[PDB]
């Protein structure tokens, strides 16, 4: 169930960290520091290789929010593979969701393969429910899902990923590729958005 | 202009580096070490911000091969922006070229991030499409640029390495979808060249 | 700024959530400060340091042994600032043990911005002593960066100029902090189990 | 393994292609070994060390000051291996050499241990041949030397782990110094003539 961040977690003062100046007024607190995300991701990579390392893996990135987690998770997986006795090749693909998948290879590349789906965040779990359905029709050897964040919410349809970075409360977070109206993707920490930031970048 | 790698560059013995096990007999030499790419990319990030830091930047990744260079270049740019501030907001988008609405590019500093440029036709093609939507500025960063008389003449704005006319893999560059899961840029061996075809 | 405040009742992190050196699996209780969190805090400290000390040649003094990890990473962040900024300053380094053992002649400190880098402040007596010696070599300025500062009644009231984390009165190991020379080979700051405390007991 | 062989006619890289401290901008001639390349080689050396020296307790011995960076990074890669694999324990010590051994714990700590000596550079090999000659009479289980650099020169010894074999050029950076300067530099570089004059003692 990953690293549990409780509802009462204050987070960290912005001034205790290096923060891009253009977002200085737009953030309330640092919620999950970049380095903590790395540490957690290093362990997740090992759990992935343990469960899925026996056969060729197709890593599927869910753009856009998933791009940072995906890149770093794969870098840790690569670090394992070039310092071990045994490994399996990995292929990568990228998709965007619209219950319609856009971009990416013909999903026949997934049959017979060990498919790892990489998301930034699970909320109600409906987005993942639909995607898994589309994927399992192509009869892959195995489908697992890694999500950096899983929200505790009375709206979850019951779905839970196989790999979870952090279990967080239902707050709106940004950073580490997670966005608010396309903003805050260029931020290494996961942070909570300020009220003024929310008004300034509102559409 | 970038780091010039000559035609006679021997590259490195694989045994001198950490190489993923499943590619051990599929590679011949390490051509550009992962860390050398990182060092070059750090300098490129600074060059990008000197040129494009005056206004909102849309970073445009050309999938799939550009994804690694893209992620690392942006990491270095972000390091600059949080440690010398003095900074500019940046948005990102991703596109694949098959041989978001491009109105989002209007009035912005667009940086196209590419893995490799050979003839330069792909980039010229992409640029002609982008410029229809009137960005304030378009620049292209390419990790690799091949030395070849087959070049149509197009020169990108930011170049990591100028390399000879060799087929290279690694750092997200593929051979029939293989070798993307490799941190070094390397040259493929004959054994590997006939196993993944 | 007292740095990042870790309260008395911070439970820390379950070991199974992180990559832990296998030979220390039973020897640790909880992860207290993850390595990455140390890195992020250290990055800001590096900027804080240059802001105050970047006007003149800096001599960075590492207090061995426990200070070596924090020292290496802090300097790495400082160097990152120095090669990506319009202007910068030369930095020289030296290493001392406190019993002052080793190190160059302290006349090398004369006229320089001296940065003392420590792993942990407890009572503050070690630093007060060192500071009162260093001043007699007339540095341009002298500052102390400590990764950790303990909340203790035992404090003589010395506070360093740069602090990573303010922690409760617990014994911690990792990130070069040792328990009888063990646990220096650990990237996280952690709390030692009863099993490991007896197993590595002198 | 003689390590990564850098040939005598190695031109190095233009400084302008890399991020370099402005205070050294006129003091360096060329970048010789980029920091990232050092990392890549060190990663592999870490696996080589652990294959040969694991598993018994390893005492890692850093030869200050030049060795401190290579020491810190080599040990970081070793620790990455120790926390992402099956089975692996190290203690560290730091020594300085007087032209004797200064600082350090009493070398009785080395007895019955796997001792890894970590150095920045080997020239004549005298410094280390003399050091090994001392360490051994404390009867360690084994003693190995990892050196970042070995120069091609008249040499009265061969280390067990080598990062790079370099020509007979004076190099600085990555903790390697010229009269205490250039330690605050991530790349290994060749010193310019103005840099020699400027920081001359
Ligand atoms: N940055 C950020 N985004 C959040 C957050 N929560 C949700 Br839902 N989202 C949005 C996720 N949604 C993105 C659609 P759009 O906003 O039009 O680009 C869908 C992602 O998939 C998970 C949602 P679900 O499990 O189906 O309820 C959050 O806390 N932070
Ligand atoms: N990995 C690798 N690929 C190379 C290389 N050279 C070319 Br051309 N390519 C092919 C680039 N192409 C790969 C398409 P796909 O078959 O789906 O993977 C993409 C376009 O690149 C731009 C070449 P151009 O400047 O227009 O001549 C190379 O050295 N290494
Ligand atoms: N690993 C660890 N060590 C701690 C801790 N607290 C102290 Br005090 N120490 C010991 C610090 N001391 C160990 C030296 P020695 O035992 O003689 O080799 C060094 C000096 O630290 C400064 C304490 P002070 O501020 O003068 O009260 C701790 O929480 N963790
Ligand atoms: N930075 C740098 N230094 C070099 C170099 N070559 C030598 Br010799 N040295 C000098 C190393 N020596 C002088 C240090 P100090 O007493 O502080 O002046 C230190 C030990 O290195 C071993 C040399 P050796 O193998 O015994 O000939 C070099 O290429 N670069
Ligand atoms: Mg999502
Ligand atoms: Mg969104
Ligand atoms: Mg391309
Ligand atoms: Mg101490
Ligand atoms: Mg101690
Ligand atoms: Mg030496």
Domains and CATH numbers, chain C: 1-202 (3.40.50.2020)
Six token digits for residue C103: 């190190």
Q: Hey, what are A12's tokens?
A: 């960290």
DSSP state of D110: G
Q: How far apart are the first and last CA of chain B?
A: 33
- Rounded Cα distance, A57 and A91, in Å: 6
Q: Which ligand is nearest to the CA of C177?
A: 3
Q: Which two tokens stand for residue D24?
A: 């050294």
> What's the token pair of residue B186?
């390397």
d(CA B19, CA D35): 19
Could B87 and A20 be called an inter-chain contact, meaning their C-beta atoms sit closer than 8 Å? yes
Element (H or E) spanning C200, and its range? Answer: none
Residues whose beta carbons lie less than 5 angstroms from ion ligand 5: A 65, 119-121
Helix axes C35-53, A34-52, angle to 10 degrees: 150
Mutant choice from B1, B4, B29, B36 vs D, greatest count of D C-beta within 10 A: B36
Of residues A46, A113, A110, A43, the one with CA closest to residue A84: A46
Q: Whole-angstrom Cα distance, residue B115 to residue C102?
A: 50
Ligand 4 atom with the smallest distance to the CA of D178 is 1
CA distance linking residue B74 with residue B141, whole number of Å: 12
Q: Residue C176: CB within 6 Å of ligand 3?
A: no
Report the candidate in C198, C193, C201, C200 with the shortest Cα–Cα distance to residue C30: C193
B12 interaction partners in chain D (CB closer than 8 Å): 4
Residue C147 CA neighbour count, 13 Å, CB half:
29
For chain D, the first-to-last Cα distance in angstroms comes to 37
> Burial level of A199, CB count in 10 A (0-12/13-18/19+)?
exposed
- DSSP conformation letters of C115-177: EEEEEEESSSHHHHHHHHHHGGG--SEEEEEEEEEE--TT--S---SEEEEEE-S---BBTTB
Find out whether B116 is annotated in a ligand binding site: yes
- Which residue of chain B is at minimal alpha-carbon distance from D33? B36
Residues of chain B contacting A106 with CB distance shorter than 8 Å? none
The CA R_g of chain C, rounded to the nearest whole Å, is 17
Structure tokens at A27: 């953030």
CA nearest C17: which of A162, A43, A146? A43
Distance between A111 CA and the closest CA of chain C, angstroms: 32
What gap in Å lies between CA C179 and CA D156, rounded to an integer? 41
Alpha helices for chain D (secondary structure H): 35-53, 68-82, 126-135, 193-198
Phi, psi of C147 (to 5 degrees): -65, -45
> Exposed e or buried b for every residue in C13-42, given b needs 16+ CB within 10 A?
bebebbbbbebbeebbeebbbbbbbbbbbb
Give the helix/strand (H/E) hosting A14: none
A198 secondary structure, DSSP code: H
**Pairing state of beta strands C162-167 and C189-192?**
unpaired
- Please give the method by which this entry was determined: X-ray
**Among candidate residues B93, D18, C99, the one with its CA nearest the CA of residue A67:** B93
Q: Please state the separation of Cα A91 from the chain's center in Å.
A: 18
Cα→Cα distances D22→C45, D4, D35, Å: 22, 29, 17
Which is catalytic among the residues B118, B157, B165, B181? B118
Query: Cα–Cα distance between A93 and D197 in angstroms, integer?
Result: 55
Report the candidate in C28, C40, C24, C73 with the shortest Cα–Cα distance to residue C190.
C28
Enter the tokens of residue D180. Answer: 């205490």
CB pairs under 8 A between A and C: 52
Q: Are B89 and A22 in contact (CB under 8 A)?
A: yes
Residue with tokens 């060249």: B193
**Which SS3 state, helix, strand or coil, does residue D60 take?**
strand
Enumerate the β-bridge partners of residue B90.
B57
Which one of A118, A121, A167, A187 would you pick to mutate in the ligand 1 pocket, going by the greatest count of ligand atoms within 8 A of its CB? A121
- D121 carries a ligand binding annotation: yes
C68-82 and C35-53 helices, crossing angle to 10°: 60
Whether B83 contacts chain C with CB within 8 A: yes
In the structure, ligand 9 is a single-atom ion and the residues with CB under 5 Å from it are C 178
Six-digit token string for A119: 């998301």
Residues pairing with B179 in the sheet:
none
Q: Do C181 and D91 touch (CB under 8 A)?
A: yes
- Chain C contacts in chain D segment 102-131 (CB below 8 A): 102-103
Q: How far apart are CA A49 and CA A69, in angstroms?
A: 16
CB of C61 closer than 8 Å to CB of C114: yes
Is the C-beta atom of C167 inside 6 A of ligand 3? no
């Amino acid at each position: 169930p990953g690293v549990v961040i409780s509802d009462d977690e204050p987070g960290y003062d912005l001034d205790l960290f290096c923060i891009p100046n253009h977002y200085a007024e737009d953030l309330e607190r640092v919620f999950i520091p970049h380095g903590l995300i790395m540490d957690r991701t290093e362990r997740l990579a090992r759990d992935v290789m343990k469960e899925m390392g026996g056969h060729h893996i197709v890593a599927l990135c869910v753009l856009k929010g998933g791009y940072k987690f995906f890149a770093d998770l794969l870098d840790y997986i690569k670090a394992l593979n070039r310092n071990s006795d045994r490994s399996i090749p990995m292929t990568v693909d990228f998709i965007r969701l619209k219950i319609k998948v856009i971009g990416g290879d013909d999903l026949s590349t997934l049959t017979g393969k060990n498919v790892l789906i990489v998301e930034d965040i699970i909320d109600t779990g409906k987005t993942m429910q639909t995607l898994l359905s589309l994927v399992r029709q192509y009869n892959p050897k195995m489908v697992k899902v890694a999500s950096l964040l899983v929200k505790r919410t009375p709206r979850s349809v019951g779905y839970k990923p196989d790999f979870v970075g952090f279990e967080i409360p239902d707050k709106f977070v940004v950073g580490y590729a997670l966005d608010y109206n396309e903003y805050f993707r260029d931020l290494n920490h996961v942070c909570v958005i300020s009220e003024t930031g929310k008004a300034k970048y509102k559409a």
